[PDB]
Design a protein around this ligand. Structure first.
Ligand code: NAD
Ligand code: NAD
Ligand code: YXW
Ligand code: YXW
Lengths: 271, 258
């Protein structure tokens, strides 16, 4: 217990310092996203909202979607103060029909989205037998099925121009199971799979201009879930910074904190 | 290079399997519910359970195919009950669980095998088919497990078998909706294992079957059915959590993480 704490803590410093060393010695080049049409779902609060702020500083043209009218317009007001041109829409990102109709409006009002951030998410923590079936369905409808309908609507223009970036906001819950989050983990594993199979298909289809990134943070202080009872302290602006740095550098799998990948590599060796 | 790692891992495993073997439990007299048992993996898994002397509950939307499996199981000496159930339909699942309870009793081993696939690139897929894929390959696992888990918990004895794929571990072009639904099946199994553990439920075991392509006619040809059914039964009896078919496929998965 004292031995395994000091063992993994040393690697939380070893992997982290090794990465910050390679990041200066052999760096990945940063692209520009200025003037790109960025659509962010769940832009009304938390990660989506702070990702919208990063894109506003990057000089992108923003399209913000959310079911919360007040929340998304509040993010847009901050983005406009940052100097960005912003369009907001009230869209249920778990509703296939609402998504398609809103994509026609985005096309007519702004133009063709070049960067899609599938951020909107839901969760109803409970043990399997305490979950409501309506909750399981909502979780899948928003966390994964919505990613299909939005990507399918926006991908044809990106393919035609051979230029785009599909950003999947998953979780470390898409890599490991967590108790009381069975429907949620399952939907997040589905998001990781969509990103992986999408990357491989574009490659197989000879589509070189469309990039893919998958954001996998640990618990974040956004109010999305109730703070763990007794238990890595992660703030919203840190996650939004990690995501923007990942997108600009065309990084496929963005773990937040980046060192979290050692636990994932370790699990693939355990008895 | 990789052809050698395949022979090395395979022979290392067959060596440990005789030197330090896992003990095999009995499933004789257990009430085993197998979904999509009207053909392929589910059918040949039903045959393995019939030889194991289990009581069988076979579900499928293919009535003729499921009664054909049942006839073979009965020849093998097993008692078998068949039901025509859409394992992607929540209402049909719940009503059928009422009928299973009234006619057979409490299921102790659940095999979530029923599955669907519509190969096509993302932009060629039909939205109705993406929904069907999720409804059957994962959402159905929630409704069936939720219905059958309460009796297993009460008795602290059960086994939840998730039939996923290597597609639940790696992405495949032309199988985006399918891979996504299979990743969801792997995640359900992983989070379910960890939750039972956290809740102090020691008697309920979990296994996840992840085969590569199998010659069942599930998809057009780019591993035989009886081989997969044998691997699954050997995995269940030995309480193995992750059953890759072929078992050596795990080296490619360990390699991808580097
Ligand atoms: N918070 C964490 O601990 C954590 C960790 C890892 C990953 N994530 C993921 O990050 C994403 C954003 O979560 P967050 O922590 O910023 O949460 P949040 O509660 O701060 O905000 C999520 C936003 O999504 C919106 N939304 C919900 N349902 C929607 C729908 N049907 N249509 C449109 N918008 C909808 C909400 O209105 C809200 O503004 C989610 O996909 C979540 O699963 C969160
Ligand atoms: N065949 C492969 O290459 C392969 C590889 C890995 C995993 N798998 C998985 O193995 C499982 C079984 O596939 P298979 O290869 O034996 O296919 P199969 O075609 O031989 O049979 C699948 C069975 O599922 C039944 N089914 C389909 N929809 C159903 C529904 N709504 N309700 C009830 N039953 C339903 C079908 O009637 C059929 O009998 C699936 O979960 C599949 O995804 C298959
Ligand atoms: O950890 C996240 N939230 C915190 C919770 O809200 C509260 C704690 C429970 C886990 O509780 C236990 C775990 C193991 C044993 C016993 C527990 F009780 C998960 C939900 C969380 C939620 C979304 C994410 O996307 C994410 F990465 C992390
Ligand atoms: O491999 C399985 N089926 C085979 C196909 O039926 C036919 C080939 C395509 C993949 O094609 C390509 C992949 C990469 C590059 C170029 C391709 F053309 C998948 C579907 C298969 C199907 C279910 C499973 O569960 C599984 F594990 C495997």
């Amino acid at each position: 217990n004292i031995i395994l704490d000091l063992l993994l803590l040393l690697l939380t410093i070893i992997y982290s310092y090794l990465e910050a060393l390679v990041k200066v010695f052999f760096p990945r080049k940063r692209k520009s996203v200025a003037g790109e049409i960025v659509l962010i779902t769940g832009a009304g609060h938390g990660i989506g909202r702070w990702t919208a702020y990063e894109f506003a500083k990057q000089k992108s043209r923003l399209v913000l979607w959310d079911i919360n009218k007040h929340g998304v317009e509040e993010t847009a007001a901050e983005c406009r103060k940052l100097g960005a041109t912003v369009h907001t829409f009230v869209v249920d990102c778990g509703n296939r029909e609402d998504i398609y109709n809103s994509v026609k409006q985005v096309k007519k009002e702004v133009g063709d989205v070049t960067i899609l951030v599938n951020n909107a998410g839901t969760v109803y923590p409970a043990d399997l037998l305490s979950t409501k079936d309506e909750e399981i369905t909502k979780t899948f409808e928003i966390n994964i099925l919505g990613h299909f309908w939005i990507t399918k609507a926006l991908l044809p223009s990106m393919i035609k121009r051979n230029h785009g970036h599909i950003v999947t906001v998953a979780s470390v819950c898409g890599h490991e199971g967590i108790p009381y989050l069975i429907p949620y983990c399952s939907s997040k594993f589905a998001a990781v799979g969509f990103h992986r199979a999408l990357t491989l298909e574009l490659q197989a289809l000879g589509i070189t201009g469309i990039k893919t990134s998958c954001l996998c943070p640990v618990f974040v202080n956004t109010g999305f879930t109730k703070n763990p009872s007794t238990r890595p302290i992660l703030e919203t602006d840190t996650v939004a910074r990690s995501l923007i740095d990942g997108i600009l550098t065309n990084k496929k799998m963005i773990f937040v904190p980046s060192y979290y990948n050692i636990y994932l590599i370790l699990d693939k060796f355990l008895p």
